[PDB]
Each structure stands twice: as structure tokens, then as C-alpha cells.
Amino acid sequence: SASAEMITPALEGATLSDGQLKDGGKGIKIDEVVKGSPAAQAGLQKDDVIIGVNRDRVNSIAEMRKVLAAKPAIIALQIVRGNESIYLLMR
Amino acid sequence: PLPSLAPMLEKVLPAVVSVRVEGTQPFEGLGSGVIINASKGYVLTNNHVINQAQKISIQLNDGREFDAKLIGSDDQSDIALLQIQNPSKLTQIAIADSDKLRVGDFAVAVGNPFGLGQTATSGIVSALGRSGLNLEGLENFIQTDASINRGNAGGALLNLNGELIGINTAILAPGGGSVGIGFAIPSNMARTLAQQLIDFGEIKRGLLGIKGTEMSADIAKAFNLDVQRGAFVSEVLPGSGSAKAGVKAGDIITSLNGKPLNSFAELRSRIATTEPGTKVKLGLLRNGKPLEVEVTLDTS
Amino acid sequence: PLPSLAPMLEKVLPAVVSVRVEGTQPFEGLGSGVIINASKGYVLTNNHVINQAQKISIQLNDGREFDAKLIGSDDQSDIALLQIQNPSKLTQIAIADSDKLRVGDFAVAVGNPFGLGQTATSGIVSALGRSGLNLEGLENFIQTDASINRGNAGGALLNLNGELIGINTAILAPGGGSVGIGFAIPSNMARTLAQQLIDFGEIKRGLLGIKGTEMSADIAKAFNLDVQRGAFVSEVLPGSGSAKAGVKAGDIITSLNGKPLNSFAELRSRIATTEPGTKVKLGLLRNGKPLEVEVTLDTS
Amino acid sequence: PLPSLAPMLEKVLPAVVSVRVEGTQPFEGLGSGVIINASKGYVLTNNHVINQAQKISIQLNDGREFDAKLIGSDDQSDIALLQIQNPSKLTQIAIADSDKLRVGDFAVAVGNPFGLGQTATSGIVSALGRSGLNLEGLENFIQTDASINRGNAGGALLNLNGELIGINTAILAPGGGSVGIGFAIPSNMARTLAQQLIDFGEIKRGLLGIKGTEMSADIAKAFNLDVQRGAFVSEVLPGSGSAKAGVKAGDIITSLNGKPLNSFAELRSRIATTEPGTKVKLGLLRNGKPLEVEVTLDTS
Amino acid sequence: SASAEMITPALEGATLSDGQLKDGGKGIKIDEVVKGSPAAQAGLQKDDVIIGVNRDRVNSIAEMRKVLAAKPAIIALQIVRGNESIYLLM
Amino acid sequence: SASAEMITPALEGATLSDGQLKDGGKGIKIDEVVKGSPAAQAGLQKDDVIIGVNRDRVNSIAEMRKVLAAKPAIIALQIVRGNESYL
């Protein structure tokens, strides 16, 4: 489980790994979040499964890193917390 | 023969009053107010003029003095309604539709600056729909360059016919004095809030159950769009009216009941005006495709 | 085709001049003035512009320069009169009736702000009969919201016909610059005092023999009265004309020459303007009963 | 029915834009600009707003955002020209003749004070040809009393027809807020400099070859002269066109092209604007004798 | 002699007594004025006799105390310095 | 050597002497100008020849003193640095 700090400053304090959804769809599962960290500030929580960045779909930490290597202005994670859909936003 | 505003100000000035407040170490404060109902003595004023008062007095511009009682108050919109005890020979203002205003219309501000007494100043409407000043929970301000100073809060903003178009609330001042940037609450929202306070004694806020942020061109360049004004939807709370209606995250609200939105705080204030149980129309754009949605309001 | 103030300002601006004062560490001061007699070169200005001058110079807006002498002055009303040596090709102002002014009339201020040169600004008449600023002995000011700054003292306040309605005399501001609250001496008092100075060289001040306080809505509640504005007489000095008339301690002054009195300061200033030996009629209120009392003034 | 500036403002407002600048500790600045060519996206702005930018962005009043590139600048006159990258559906302003302006004309200032957004204020023209403020090398300012604050530089000053008459440049403020004294570059100078920047990329300044000082009532009182406004010439640089024309030291310059000169700075700016190689008419006053002199301008 | 501060804080600095006028009318003769006291600042002087509070007549210190126990918004003292009538505002 | 300080302080630091022009006309040749003195600030230079005060024509240091005893408003000197001619 690579620490999310190295990928981007905004995800400091979040533990990300390559996991699975309830239905088998691939996604990146959030393992542990530091209280007060920017990940906690943005709304990331335990056992969240991110699905897509903007109009994309990320199935691995490497895929997310390749997407983020271009360093876009803003990030929006379609995320998955519970059986519904929420967007997030940080710079 | 010479043009002037004197003929119309003669019939209107008696409706604007001065509000004197004492309370607590004791304090004394001064503000303005507008007579809304002459028979029942209802006075519209600002909420921070009255906040910590134990005694409230009203003074007419001819010298008469009355005692007042607080009927209701709105801290989010900063609007208070007082009642005059034993009213006698009062004059009331007429209210204009502030949805028909435009930038460039002429305006008159009547108030009580620095405790000097009743004063009228003149200017134009500089802007509409101003918000984001981190002043109140609700901001849909009219901007004007009529001179507005300390003691003017609660007073009247009028057009050339002498009809109410705003309630003076705030100024932007680098050094504690007027530089020509003043803000007013539009009269439609103020009238609706005053009627709710009269009818029920407190406000019933309706909520959409949608959490979202301001739309911009930066986001439009991230979702391949053309619209740069509106509200961006991010969270749909469970079981709300919009959740039942089918509104999902990632969408953009453009028009409310067919009226295009220029801000997200604009939509917030418009929804806060609406009473719960009403059905509203949302013009939506999801994945670049437009739609029309009917929504039932909740209760806050 | 387009509306403008230029056609009437083209004829009036030569009458407003700049006043330069050198005195004594020495100081150099700046103000304005208005030419009222073109053949004799009489110039009306403020008293605190000329207060401790050792030499006075006058500049026209075309560049010509003159030396000036003080004919007389009045400290209580803050009015001074100068005469130009060897005048030639001058323009004079016409004086309007300031008793016909109303709140909402349009006004133009002409002066010399910050030593820049001749400058015109525009506004409305905000209020009438203002006092209590503790500036001079007599205060019956016109309150206007034209931009008025340092160097505008002594200068002109005009109506849309180009006639003088006031002499700019003061301002209120936390930061030292205009916020839209300026004060002017009305033209009737200034004209009367200037005529007195021309004719005799000193002011002729009349008094009533009444010492009293300002009537409020509180004193009208302790004697069970109705009118809340006027003057409350508490001392009638022995041997005065008012004593011969029959004014006693405790009554209320309501009208001067039939015109209702807005304040006690207005009564004081209007009495001080009037010439000793004149006869006035006072509308008196005693024990809830109205009366009319004829009083002959004495000399100060 | 009611008079307003709204009908004419609705057509001109899209042509005034806000200018956001990022530069270098990193800094962000804000100002305004005017669209003078819609097909090419040419934007007139102030030089000190754009000074140390690394990136420039233009934002329209409907929300669209564009990138801009500097075309040219003029530090003495403080005028900058930008081009919009990839323009689409723009509105442009119409320019008026600023040599026909008079004191008392009505004016509207459109800008972006304190970063709030597009704002309009109203006033009159207070003075013409102001200078001596020691802000730029060449000053021939229009003075106005519309409210102009921080963020207004580069924006529009318009007449009642919606035609450009000036570019807002500076203010005089004791405490960092507007007190009613603002300055604008006249539109004739601005349009000439803009054409020069478009055609050549830099300004071609012409000079006379004369060193002199301002005329006053004191110098004229020593040479027994009547005039008191104009230019007093003290040195004629050898080899110049003026020396070839015969202009000597001690002469008084009265009129340029038959139009009266009110100061040395007006003559300086008017000569600087005129293109090199052009011929000009000088009204000379030497030993009290008038002369007409033809001068051919050189290159600076 | 009676203390005037106990009657009201306004009349601090006045020495009082039940007195009589020149024509025999009963009043409140001022006997000592403290310099700098509120009584001196208001304008009370020696030998002054108060024949009124607001719209009433006070015949003794007790009656004035009874009227002032209501604590009115202001006080209006007829006094009688000289063979005349001077009002006061408290 | 006539010091210019008590003649007029505006010419302080300028050494004055009765001389003649290149054609033999009379005037005052400025022998020395002290750097930072009021004369240098006003524009006086070494070897300058003042040949006029305001409109009047002057010839000697005594004539300078007699003219400037009245203390006029402004003195517009003519002077003649090189073969050309105000301060």
C-alpha cells in the first residue's frame, strides 16, 4: 500500500490500495485516513472506493498516478461511499 | 420650473423613522427603519440594529416618539420586524417589484447618518445580484453609489416614484467612511420575509437537499461545456425532494422556474424565500444534455 | 442636444476666485471666495481662511492676480469681506432666496480643492437647518452631498440657474476626506452680514433677553404638552424688551414671524441676524394656551 | 417612462472587460480594459496594471475567459495595448472627440473596483487639462467626480451617448478611498497612441528643440506683459527645427495651430503626440510683439 | 439640616432646611453649596428657595422627597433667586 | 575678488569679477562655481558672463549691487555661455 502523499499533495494522510467493490468492479480502496489531514479535510473516509477522476475511470494506483501525472488544475473523484454517488473537489 | 426631487420626497419622508436602542456594560445604538403598515404600526429594520436591545424607541421626523416591541427577527437575512405601541397618525411606504430593476436606474437613499437626523442622498444602481461578501448567510444585494454611512442601516432605498426597492444593510469602506459602494436587500425578499413574520411569528425555510458549489469557466474547461454561470451539483442528500425527483451529482442548474441563474448564492436565497410544499422548476444540464425537472421542497 | 450644466457654468465660473493667505513659523493658506460687487471688487469668504493673515492675494480663473484688504469680518457667523485693489473687467454673482429651498433640490459646489484649481462638483440638498456641530456661535446650515474637501471653504454653492444659495463652511469625515456630508451658510444670512460690514464695518447683533434650552419630546412629557419642537425659556432677564413684552420663565416659543421654529439654535441665529431696534412677533405657548407677543430687540 | 441610464448602458457594457495579471514573491493584480476592435480583439488598458505580468487574462461580463498578449506600451503616457487570443463574438466601443468637452458635461465611469465585478458610477466633468500631479511625464488629464477606486484603472469614461471620452488613470485620495477627485487620459491622445502602437509597435515622439518653463503672473509682471498663461522659452537647442525657424530665447508661446495654450505641460503633450516631420504653427510673443512661426518637428 | 444626597443623587452638594420666604411662604432654603458638587454644577446658589418640582408645589423637604421618590425623567425647579422665577433642568 | 553671498544669496558659491566679452563689451565673468552651491543649482557655470539683469543691462559689481538692493521678485539673468544667450 503506497502512501498517497507521493502521488499528489492534496491526498496527504490517506492509505490507498488496489481493491474491489461489492459488485466486483475494480477501484482504489481507501484504507486509513489521518484525522485533520487534507484527505480528511476534503471528505475522504474509511473504506471508500474511488471510481473515476473527472470523465475517466481508474482501476489501479498506477492508473491514477498516470492520470494525475499531467497535474490538472482541479480533481473530482466520482468516489463511492455507500450505495450512492458523491463528487469531491480539491486543488 | 427647475427639475428637482423635492415634490416626491415630500410625500415619502414621513415613512422613514429613526430607531434608538439601549442595552448591555450598557450601550446605546442608532439606526433607521421603514413603516410598512400604518394601521398596525409595523416597522421593517435591520437585525443587528436590535440584537441586544432591552428597550427600543421610534422617532418620527416631526419629533414624536413611540415605544416599540420586537415581533420577529431573521439572522440569516438580517431582517427584523417591530411593532409600535399605540400608533397614531402614521404614513406607510409603497413597495416596488425589484425583479424589474436594471443597472443605470436612479436611486435615493434615506437614512440617519452619524446621528445627525434624516438625510437623503442620490445615486444610481451600480450592480445587481451581488454576494460573496461574507456578510450574511443569504446575499442577493443591490449595489449603489448613493452615500451611505453609519446609522443608515435599516433605512430606505427608493426609485424616482418614491417606492421601496431596497433596505440598506452594508457598505464597503477602507477607512470607515463612504467611498461609493453600498449594499441593500431587495424589496421582494424583504416583503416576503415580513409577511411570514407577521403571519407565523417565525420563518419556515425550505431546502432542496442539494449541496453544491459555484460554477465557473475553470470547471467548464474541465467538463467540456459552454456555460460559465450557474450552480454545480455535488451531493444529493438521501430522501430529499430532489433525490425523489431524480437529480444526480455532476449536473449543472441553469434556470430556476425559467429564470437563468447568475450565481449559486442567488439560487440559495431564492430557495430560502420559497415556502415548503411548493413545486419548482429546474433547468438542468447533465453530460452536456439539457433537461427540465420538477422538485418538491423540504423543510429546514 | 445632450443635457449638461456647461451652458450655465460658462457664465458663472469667472465670479469664483482663489484666495491665498501668507501669515505668521510662517504659514501659507488657501481658500476660495465669491465676487459680489464687480465695480468695487468686494469678495465674500470664510473667516478662518483669513483669520491670522498678514498678506492676502486673489487669483481669477484666467490667471490674473490682485492684492486684497480686509474690510471687516464676523467671528460668530464665520463670514469675512475683502476688497480688491484696482479692479478691472470683473464678473459678479447673483444671489438667490434660500428661504425657498427644499430637500431634494439640485446643487453645484464650485471651489479650489487641494490647491488644484477651480473645480465643480454636483449633488442634492440633503437637509436644512442643521446645527449642533459646535463650530461657531450661529449655525443654520444647509447640508449637501456634493464632494467638498479642504480648499473649498469660502466657495460657492449654486442652484441650476447659476445663482448663489450658499457659502461652503464645514464637513464631517473620520478620515479627513469627503464622505458626502458638507455644510454651507445660507445666502440670506451671508448677504445681510456682508451689507452690514460694507455699511458700518462691524456687525450689529440683536438679542431677546431670553435664556433657555432646546425643547425635546421629554420636556413636553413632563408638562403634558403637545408640540415637541421649539424653544423652552427658563430665564427672562430684568429690564429687557421681552420683559416689557411679558415673557415669563417656563413658556414655549413656537413661531418666529409666523414661521414655525424647527429648533432653538435656528431662533438664536435668526434673532442674531436681525438689526437692533426692530420689532418682532413671537408665537408663545404658556400653560397650554397660545399667545402672540410683540418684542423690541436691544443691542449687544 | 422614468429617466434612466439603463437603455444606453445595455449596449456598451459588454465592451468593458476585467484584466487579471499574474507576476513576480508571486503577485496578482486586477484592472480594467476597453475593447476598441472586435474583429482583432484589440484592448486598451493602463500601463502600470500590465507592467510586470508574466501571464494576462481577460474576463468578459458574461463570464467567458481568454488569454491576452501585449502588443505595445507607452510609459510616459501610461497607455498599453493588448490582443485577445482567439476572439469570438465581441463588442467594441465607439470613440468621441474629447476636444469638444466642457466643464459640466455628464460622465459615466465603468470599471472593476476592489475585485467585485463590473460596476458603473456617475458624475460630471470637473476640470480640463489638469497636470502637475507628478505621476506621468505627460499629463493632460480630465478631472471627474465619479466614484473611482482601486481596480478602476484601465476602464471606461463615457458620455451620455455611450461613447468613450477618456481612460481612467489616477485618483487623489487622502486615505485610500475615493473623495471625488479622479483623472482620465483624453480619448484623442489615447486613440493616436493606439494607432501608432498598432502600426509600428512603438511610439514616435516629436520634439521642438526648446527648453522653457511655465508662464505666470509674476514673470509677466517683470517683462511688462499682459498674458499670464502659456510657455516661456529660455533656451533654443542649436541645430533644431525651431532654431532654423528663428525662435529665440525669452519668447512667449501663445497658441498652437490657433488654439490657446493654458500651460507648458499642454504644449509638451500636444507636441509629443504629433508625428515627427509634421509642421506646426506657433504664436510667438517676443518683446511684446506678436509673430507667426512655422516649425518642422524632428525625431526624439 | 438635612442631607440632600439621600433625597436623590442629583442634589449632591446642597445643604437644605425647611424655610420661609420673604412674604412668609414656606420653602426650601439652600444653606450651603459645595464647590464642584453636582448642585453647584447645576446652578444652585445660597439663599435659594425651591417652590416647585415640575408642575407641583413643594412646601417642605418631606413633600419634595415624596415627589422625587417617583424618580421622574427630569426635574424642573421654580426656585426664587431674587424677586423672580428661574427654572432649572436636572 | 568679490564674494557673491552678501550681494545675493541666490548666487552663493559664485566668484564674481569685472571683465569683458570677446568683443570688448562689459560684463561679469564667473570665475568659479562651487559644486553644490546655490549658483551651481541655479545653473551658473565657470567662465559665464552675466550681461543683463531682467530687462536692464548691467556692467559692474557695483551696478549689480545697486540693481539688486531693491530685492525684486524674480531676476531673469540674460548671461552668454558661448556664442549664444535665460535663468
Nearest to C70 by CA among C94, C113, C41: C41
Q: B213: helix, coil or strand?
A: strand
Q: Which residues does A70 contact at the CB level (< 8 Å), separation at least 6?
A: none
Query: How far is it, in rounded angstroms, from Cα B271 to Cα B175?
Result: 35
Answer yes or no: is F36 within a domain.
yes
Containing H/E element for B205?
none
By the 8 A CB rule, do A90 and A75 touch?
Answer: yes
Look-up of cell digits 411569528: B201
Nearest to B281 by CA among B260, B266, B299: B260
Answer yes or no: is E77 within a domain.
no
Look-up of cell digits 436612479: B106
Instruction: Indicate the residue among C52, C84, C116 that finishes a domain.
Output: C84
Q: Which phi and psi angles does D204 have, rounded to 5°?
A: -105, 105
Q: Which residues does B105 contact at the CB level (< 8 Å), separation at least 6?
A: B124, B125, B159, D2, D4, D5, D6
Burial class (CB in 10 A: 0-12, 13-18, 19+), E89: middle
Q: Which phi and psi angles does D248 have, rounded to 5°?
A: -110, 175
Measure CB to CB from residue F74 to each of D218, D238, D250 and give the nearest one: D218
Give the DSSP letter string of chain A.
--BTTTT-GGGTTEEEEEEE-SSS-EEEEEEEE-TTSHHHHHT--TT-EE--BTT----SHHHHHHHHTT--S-B-B---SSSS-----B-
Task: Measure in Å the smallest separation between the Cα of D246 and chain F Cα atoms.
Answer: 13
Residue B51: how many other CB atoms lie within 10 Å: 13
How many residues are present in chain F? 87
Contacting partners of chain E (3+ CB pairs under 8 A) = C
Give the DSSP letter string of B101-149.
--TTBEEEEEE-GGGS--EEEEEEEEEEEE--SSS-S---EEEE-S---
Greatest CA separation for chain A: 32
Contacting partners of chain B (3+ CB pairs under 8 A) = A, C, D
Q: Which residues does D269 contact at the CB level (< 8 Å), separation at least 6?
A: D138, D139, D140, D189
Residue C167: how many other CB atoms lie within 10 Å: 26
Answer yes or no: is B194 within a domain.
no
Instruction: Indicate the residue among C199, C224, C245 that finishes a domain.
Output: C199
Query: How far is it, in rounded angstroms, from Cα D218 to Cα D239?
Result: 31
| Whether C186 and C263 share a structural domain | no
Q: By CA distance, what is B177's nearest residue in C?
A: C179
Sign of the CA dihedral running C52, C58, C59, C65: negative
Dump strand ranges (E) for D215-278: 231-236, 252-256, 259-260
Answer yes or no: is F11 within a domain.
yes
Residue B28: how many other CB atoms lie within 10 Å: 10
| Whether D45 and D107 share a structural domain | no
Q: By CA distance, what is F53's nearest residue in D?
A: D222
Its domain, for residue B284, covers 210-296
| Whether C116 and C192 share a structural domain | yes
In this structure, the strands spanning C279-286 and C289-296 are: antiparallel
By the 8 A CB rule, do C154 and C33 touch?
Answer: yes
Method: cryo-EM
Q: Which amino acid is at D192?
A: T
D238 vs F contacts (CB less than 8 Å): 84
Cβ contact, residue pair C105, B149, below 8 Å: no
Query: How far is it, in rounded angstroms, from Cα E6 to Cα E27?
Result: 19
Containing H/E element for E89?
none
Cell numbers of B250, please?
455532476
Q: D97, D122, D124, D140: which to substitute to probe chain C, counting the most C Cβ within 10 Å?
A: D124
Measure CB to CB from residue D180 to each of C13, C117, C147 and give the nearest one: C147
Cβ contact, residue pair E73, C221, below 8 Å: yes
User: Bridge-partner residues for D284, per DSSP?
Assistant: D253, D291
Cβ contact, residue pair B3, C160, below 8 Å: yes
Q: Which amino acid is at B159?
A: N
Look-up of cell digits 457594457: D13
Answer yes or no: is C93 within a domain.
no
Here the CATH number for the domain that contains residue C10 is: 2.40.10.10
DSSP state letter for B269: H
Q: C223, C234, C236, C248: which to substitute to probe chain E, counting the most E Cβ within 10 Å?
A: C234
Whether chain E lies against chain D with 3 or more Cβ pairs closer than 8 A is: no
Q: Which residues does A37 contact at the CB level (< 8 Å), separation at least 6?
A: A12, A13, A14
Cβ contact, residue pair D104, C5, below 8 Å: yes
Answer yes or no: is D265 within a domain.
yes
Nearest to D105 by CA among A2, B62, C5: C5
Query: How far is it, in rounded angstroms, from Cα D243 to Cα D293?
Result: 11
Cell numbers of B25, please?
456594560
Contacting partners of chain D (3+ CB pairs under 8 A) = B, C, F
In this structure, the strands spanning B94-95 and B163-171 are: parallel
DSSP state letter for C86: S
Task: Measure in Å the smallest separation between the Cα of C222 and chain E Cα atoms.
Answer: 7
Answer yes or no: is C92 within a domain.
no
Query: How far is it, in rounded angstroms, from Cα B243 to Cα A86?
Result: 13
Here the CATH number for the domain that contains residue E34 is: 2.30.42.10
Q: Which phi and psi angles does C198 have, rounded to 5°?
A: -65, -45
Containing H/E element for C11?
helix C6-12
Query: How far is it, in rounded angstroms, from Cα E90 to Cα E72?
Result: 10
Cβ contact, residue pair C249, E85, below 8 Å: yes
Query: How far is it, in rounded angstroms, from Cα D155 to Cα D167?
Result: 6
Helices (H) and strands (E) in chain C, counts: 6, 20
Number of domains in chain B: 3
Query: How far is it, in rounded angstroms, from Cα C232 to Cα C250?
Result: 7
| Whether B216 and B291 share a structural domain | yes
Task: Measure in Å the smallest separation between the Cα of E33 and chain C Cα atoms.
Answer: 21
Answer yes or no: is F62 within a domain.
yes
Nearest to F76 by CA among E77, E72, D225, B134: D225
Give the DSSP letter string of F40-57.
HHHT--TT-EE--BTTB-
Q: B58: helix, coil or strand?
A: strand
Task: Measure in Å the smallest separation between the Cα of D173 and chain C Cα atoms.
Answer: 8
Nearest to F86 by CA among D210, D25, D284: D210
C180 vs B contacts (CB less than 8 Å): 121, 147, 149, 178
Residue D295: how many other CB atoms lie within 10 Å: 23
User: Bridge-partner residues for D114, per DSSP?
Assistant: none
Q: Which residues does C221 contact at the CB level (< 8 Å), separation at least 6?
A: E73
Cβ contact, residue pair E76, C224, below 8 Å: no
| Whether C270 and C215 share a structural domain | yes
Q: D4, D18, D149, D179: which to substitute to probe chain B, counting the most B Cβ within 10 Å?
A: D4
Tell me how many residue pairs between chain C and chain D have CB atoms under 8 A apart: 85
DSSP state letter for B14: G
Q: C196: helix, coil or strand?
A: helix
Dump strand ranges (E) for chain C: 16-23, 27-37, 42-45, 53-59, 65-74, 79-84, 106-111, 119-130, 141-144, 156-158, 164-171, 182-186, 206-207, 210-214, 231-236, 252-256, 259-260, 279-286, 289-296, 298-299
Sign of the CA dihedral running D164, D170, D176, D177: negative
Nearest to E28 by CA among E8, E14, E40, E9: E14
Q: F80, F84, F87: which to substitute to probe chain D, counting the most D Cβ within 10 Å?
A: F84
Query: How far is it, in rounded angstroms, from Cα A64 to Cα C55?
Result: 84
Cβ contact, residue pair C250, E85, below 8 Å: yes
Give the DSSP letter string of C139-166.
--EEEE-S---TT-TT-EEE-TTS-EEE
Cβ contact, residue pair D2, B161, below 8 Å: yes
In this structure, the strands spanning B182-186 and C289-296 are: unpaired
Query: How far is it, in rounded angstroms, from Cα C297 to Cα C275?
Result: 8
Measure CB to CB from residue D147 to each of B106, B180, B228 and give the nearest one: B180
| Whether C195 and C102 share a structural domain | yes
Dump strand ranges (E) for chain B: 16-23, 27-37, 42-46, 53-59, 65-74, 79-84, 94-95, 106-111, 119-130, 141-144, 156-158, 163-171, 182-186, 210-214, 231-236, 252-256, 259-260, 279-286, 289-296
Whether chain F lies against chain D with 3 or more Cβ pairs closer than 8 A is: yes
Cell numbers of B269, please?
436565497
By the 8 A CB rule, do B181 and B143 touch?
Answer: yes
Query: How far is it, in rounded angstroms, from Cα B133 to Cα B144?
Result: 15
Contacting partners of chain C (3+ CB pairs under 8 A) = B, D, E
Query: How far is it, in rounded angstroms, from Cα D74 to Cα D72?
Result: 7
Measure CB to CB from residue E74 to each of C222, C248, C249 and give the nearest one: C222
Cβ contact, residue pair E73, C224, below 8 Å: no
Task: Measure in Å the smallest separation between the Cα of B251 and chain C Cα atoms.
Answer: 46
Q: In what order do the strands lie in the sheet with E32-33?
A: E2-3, E14-16, E32-33
Cell numbers of B86, please?
399605540
Residue E64: how many other CB atoms lie within 10 Å: 25
